[PDB]
Design a binder for this molecule. Structure first.
Ligand SMILES: CCCC[C@H](NCc1c(COP(=O)(O)O)cnc(C)c1O)C(=O)O
Ligand SMILES: CCCC[C@H](N)C(=O)O
Ligand SMILES: CCCC[C@H](N)C(=O)O
Ligand SMILES: CCCC[C@H](N)C(=O)O
Lengths: 386, 388, 388, 383
């Protein structure tokens, strides 16, 4: 509350470690947790199975009910997003799966969603695997798409890959009594805090930016106590758990999140302007050097431009394909938020059946922590290799 | 194939490591996997997203699509269970969740299941969270319970906690064209191989026995290529993934599985007859004894008694509660298959908030036998029984 | 205290975990450890820097001074070897290095050692890198080789590779007042406990058998409080530390040590007799085999034959090289004590830096027996012998 | 075509990973490594036992001879320090131990060293445990202290704790033919590269800054092929090995080293000036502060002030003791280079040429500048 976000990222979820005479949280691989007696054991099992948080001093009983290393990572992100509690899972898709199953179980299987979403999130809603029905709606048509069966309104900003922004204040107003789930993977709690704009749930693919080194899969939703209990009820019986070492590395990554994001953001802001001058590129999508931020969201909603850039090329698919293959320092791979700069053709990786399929000339670029001159020299060499 | 199961446990899933000049498989924590070009990268993405196994030489693309350390653990168990392929997940419940969602997606949401099952598996079917409908049936009433939209027949033997056995040959005959999923957590591939009896899928909570040290959560289903694709299709979009270090420790544990199981089984067989002589215990349930097994399943289906023992006490809830609390060496905790011997009161912990019929007897006590000496374990259990 | 060695391997070094509500010890990667105040922090720093063990409740201060996971592994082995304390290091050679530097620092740089030793230990003494002087002596000539500045008598039984046994009771009598250091890597605390025969220090290359899965390097010396303090003084300033995850896996491996050792020993006892019948092998060296132990050490010193087998071939170097290269299931690699069976030519790999006079025979081949089936291992070794 | 140091920190030691279809290096825990045949296996064993680097395609044979994850971390730091090769060990003290034993083995047991050094390095030389003799000399008296059997000239800048700087160009000139070992733990390859100034060996306690999260012990010396071969010869038989997961986390930390160091340096530069205005502190030692570097080393030798701050208090031991006990956000613990801010009393923790009792060392982390200021002022006012 009185500490700045930079301090909260370092010391968040590190309570009681200094008193115990330790520097970093220990990795407890224990699958089972012994109990003091039958009465407290049975009470603690039922308490956690029904989605409640662990009481201090009580036994965790089993790893599928509670794990301390995961709980430390959960409290660390909840403080950053200004949320009451948070629930962590194996991947970002496991968190989305639990969020949708919680809505279905509560008798609300219908979901209202904006079309520019992550490929996996879009495919999971379209298939209706978890007993869900979806109505694809635009920012202005959210209120109309709301049914008496809607359990959640799913939004993502900046969108993956185009980086289209969404006004969160208007979305919450349109949803009204329906909770809003905001995928804040790209912005991170450093740039955006949807809970402050009135959102109920905030999803993050911890695999990107929260980990920051491309070596820890994870998913986490910062939300109020009601949805946290519903998500833990699902987690206890579906079991898409985050491994203790995975939780350790994601919590470890949160300490350097503010420093890494600001460094990659500075490089991305400069690269977007330098690449715009190249004749092979027709458009540069970047919230800071924007062609789609007339609403003044950069300042009101986002405290920074981000570290992602989408580039439209003048030869369509052929130029986009050649540019990706001729990169040497920049690695052609899916995923983002890592220490190294990655590149992809979203239409072929993020390809068979879609209405909101991105342009063939579009190329997504995750900016890492390399020098700005070395990254432009490599991207210019790949563009000139046409 | 021409190797004994003891040899297969050690060298299973270790192909190509000796040629690469390494002893154990490396732990690759990589979340993303680079691609050679857009054409091969995109094709590899679509094949793995549609649940296909990774073709040799192709890039894994992303960890939610494929991971090499998990794949090594998958091939190791599949060879032990005599299955074509296997799919691993974060926990045993994640594997069950994916198997049920695979059936629902194929237009078969109905499941026929025999009542004595693990608490979580029973609760997941009863709630119908994953869009499933269930008809609880007995071993003889499986054929009648089969509906036109049945996707699976779920069976578990020895059952958790009572250790009731199920004739798998008769179950497969009753199911007919419906695939049979058999939870083989308690027996492990050392004692039982349901695929040999005609089962289609074999679930294992790798958290117990496969890991063997109580430090690696996991779940895995050894099955034919058809269900392996359906399970991977669900895994790719739901993402209940097994962490590379978790997969490493479960694969590591498989090397010592036959040696650990036989050692714990020996101690369990000795403790079953020693505890039966005590007057405080009315009955000792143990698959290794042919008493409660009139069908001759120990020999045809199971090559050993196991390392789990259920005990019925003469004082009901009060004696069961006191016996658990007075144990010092034996630790009162949930879970099984570890090196440490554990004890639990199912009617007071896992099945306390459960209905009268589905919950076990208030005097029943489950005991997972470990690698401690038989004399030190009986002395501790006798001291706890005499303390009431 | 009144527990069997099998029970002690599972619960050794696991005190207070059940009270804290945890199953296995946590891996604390912390490099630094905060202090309550300047007075207690400074005193605990001085206490640990001077080689003393950590007091309960006091802060570890720094990892180079103390680490809890390593300390758990240390107390677990000390109970098995019947020693007061134990000190762990990065490798078996790091423990040997610290033992020699502790003797040199105490004004005793001379070491009396029996010639059949592991290659690295032999080369480290011959070079005199750590300011050591060595007098190579036989079992009977130990007393004569003792000089006024002797620090310790180094002995290893069964010796690497030949598997020569040494009567430890006679060695302690010959040494008299000088402490005896026994490398018990091959026997392990399951088969031999040199402390009961009067030895002062017991070195184990934890890398083999204690780990048991070929994935954790380590070294440890079970000894009295005086030598434990001297070893910790050297460790605090030289810093050859055992990593917390390495200590976790070696402590994890101790829980299955008795079960794994007995399983490999049974296979080795049968393999040594089956390989003796082959005409290509002239002699099979194994402690538990006729004409290999005239002093009756197998019974009063060793409770088992072990899991290592050395054998001489009738073609010398050419037959030894062909036999190693034609093995498929048995892997040609250095090291031992793992779950898989390994084979080597000691003259070309382990005992290569040793002087030509102390080098083993060219026809000799060392074999570490794993946990595979006895029939599959003999079929592979017979196929390799017949390929020449 | 040459890459900047910021790019080299990210992609250093990552060669062949993109071609193999992997993002980060795998952790190979293997203790032993199988061989193709007796002839190649035996030759590879002798090659690595005599301190040579592993040839591509050859088997590592055993972990005490070679480990791939450690080798990747070694090549990553060598490129940053502009050295030919590097040798990694369990701790910074294990690296110092091997550096001294390599000198003793070469018939040069005498070492010339400057008095302001790390406590452990100072105690290891004074004791003479590894068969070493030491002559303590000042910057100007290095040439005179050089004996016929001198193996190394050990220097550390900024010194631990006082942060006293040493002109490395003059030290190399004074040493002449004797190789110079520089402990570059505090500056890191981001700020200083002693190899460029003519140093032969550069030691780093990887435990600090290279790891950056206080969870990976380590030590590493960036040096030429001759000393690297000698250091690997000692490592192969003494066995103070860096664990594969430890090497993985230290290599992982190098990717964010430039970004973390610059962030902590900015906070330290502001804190040193804000704390100077407080009346309880008599003097604030920081390389970047005015009147603290008359030789112009900031610019020629160091590209930044660093993230460490030592300061003298006006009450001696009592004020220093109270200040560290009243800190709440800043943690009283030994060590440095982590994500969190640590504080210590160098006289009590870590009577041999000791620093002043009023001196307090402070490792600046990645927290906000205002929150650190508020906590330290509250602790000073509590006296
Ligand atoms: C040459 C490399 C292989 C070494 C292997 N045993 C090494 C070994 C050591 C030293 O332990 P570290 O290797 O953990 O330092 C000590 N003592 C014995 C008896 C050994 O056999 C062997 O096959 O003998
Ligand atoms: C399974 C595809 C992975 C795509 C990756 N999560 C991305 O957003 O680029
Ligand atoms: C959440 C309860 C888990 C307990 C464990 N599945 C058991 O069989 O005891
Ligand atoms: C062994 C004490 C560790 C001291 C710590 N390395 C420091 O910088 O003060």
């Amino acid at each position: 509350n009185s500490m700045h976000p930079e301090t909260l990222m370092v010391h968040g979820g590190m309570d009681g470690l200094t008193e115990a005479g330790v520097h970093v949280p220990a990795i407890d691989l224990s699958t089972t947790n012994p109990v003091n007696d039958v009465a407290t054991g049975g009470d603690s099992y039922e308490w956690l199975a029904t989605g409640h948080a662990l009481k201090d001093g009580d036994s965790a009983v089993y790893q599928r009910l509670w794990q301390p290393g995961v709980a430390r990572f959960e409290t660390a992100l909840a403080e950053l997003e200004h949320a009451d509690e948070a629930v962590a899972f194996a991947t970002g898709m496991a968190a989305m799966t639990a969020a949708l199953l919680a809505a279905v179980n509560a008798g609300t299987p219908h979901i209202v969603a904006v079309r520019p979403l992550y490929g996996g999130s879009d495919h999971l809603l379209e298939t209706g695997l978890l007993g869900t029905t979806v109505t694809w709606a635009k920012e202005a048509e959210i209120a109309s798409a709301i049914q008496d069966d809607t359990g959640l309104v799913i939004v993502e900003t900046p969108a993956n890959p185009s980086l289209d922004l969404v006004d969160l204040d208007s979305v919450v107003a349109a949803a009204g009594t329906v909770p809003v789930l905001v995928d804040n993977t790209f912005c991170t709690p450093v740039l955006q805090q949807p809970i402050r704009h009135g959102a109920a749930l905030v999803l993050h693919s911890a695999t990107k930016y929260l980990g920051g080194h491309g070596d820890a899969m994870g998913g986490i939703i910062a939300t109020n106590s009601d949805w946290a209990m519903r998500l833990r009820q699902v987690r206890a019986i579906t079991g898409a758990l985050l491994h203790p070492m995975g939780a350790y590395l994601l919590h470890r990554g949160l300490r350097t999140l503010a420093v890494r994001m600001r460094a990659a953001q500075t490089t991305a802001g400069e690269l977007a302007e330098r690449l715009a001058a190249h004749p092979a590129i027709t458009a540069v999508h970047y919230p800071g050097l924007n062609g789609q931020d007339p609403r003044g969201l950069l300042g009101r909603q986002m405290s920074g431009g981000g570290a992602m850039i989408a580039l439209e090329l003048a030869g369509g698919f052929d130029a986009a394909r050649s540019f990706v293959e001729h990169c040497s320092l920049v690695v052609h791979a899916v995923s983002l938020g890592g220490a190294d700069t990655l590149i992809q053709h979203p239409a072929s990786l993020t390809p068979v059946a879609a209405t909101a399929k991105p342009g063939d000339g579009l190329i997504r670029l995750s900016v890492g922590l390399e020098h700005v001159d070395d990254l432009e020299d490599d991207l210019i060499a790949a563009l000139d290799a046409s």
